């Protein structure tokens, strides 16, 4: 529907990353729920590299959970 209003916001995040992270002391962590429509240069390295996705559980993992609640 739009891509302008949001644009100035997006530029600033790129500016900040570049402003710091050579005397790293602050971390940036992202969460998504609709990661089917990210920006290409939100992903360009030097801005993001690890992508951790949620998995299916192991039999042994289910058990642990069960042991705690009971």
């Amino acid at each position: 529907g739009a891509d302008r209003e949001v644009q100035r916001i997006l530029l600033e995040l790129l500016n900040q990353m570049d402003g710091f992270d050579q005397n790293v002391n602050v971390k940036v962590i992202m969460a998504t729920n609709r990661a089917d429509t990210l920006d290409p240069a939100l992903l360009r390295p030097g801005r993001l590299d690890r992508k951790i996705e949620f998995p299916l559980p192991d039999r042994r993992q289910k058990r642990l959970i069960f042991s705690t609640i009971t």
Binding site: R8, I9, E12, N15
Partner: protein
């Protein structure tokens, strides 16, 4: 003396406004901000509010010139 006084403000341009909250205890509230970069909206209003149409909110203590119970939120 009072009658002339009130009359002058009526002759237009005049501000009509909308009372959002009736209430008449717990003053203070908040509107507007500073700047720099990163965008999330905020708005507030309490005691009694009128929001005038330049989009400004105002804190007034009640008068008997019109009765507040007769007024609504």
């Amino acid at each position: 003396e009072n009658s002339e006084k009130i009359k002058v403000n009526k002759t237009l341009p005049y501000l009509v406004s909308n009372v959002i909250e009736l209430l008449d205890v717990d003053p203070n509230d908040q509107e507007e901000d500073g700047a720099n970069i990163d965008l999330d909206s905020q708005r507030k209003g309490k005691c009694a509010v009128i929001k005038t149409s330049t989009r400004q909110t105002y804190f007034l203590p009640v008068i008997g010139l019109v009765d507040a119970e007769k007024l609504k939120p």
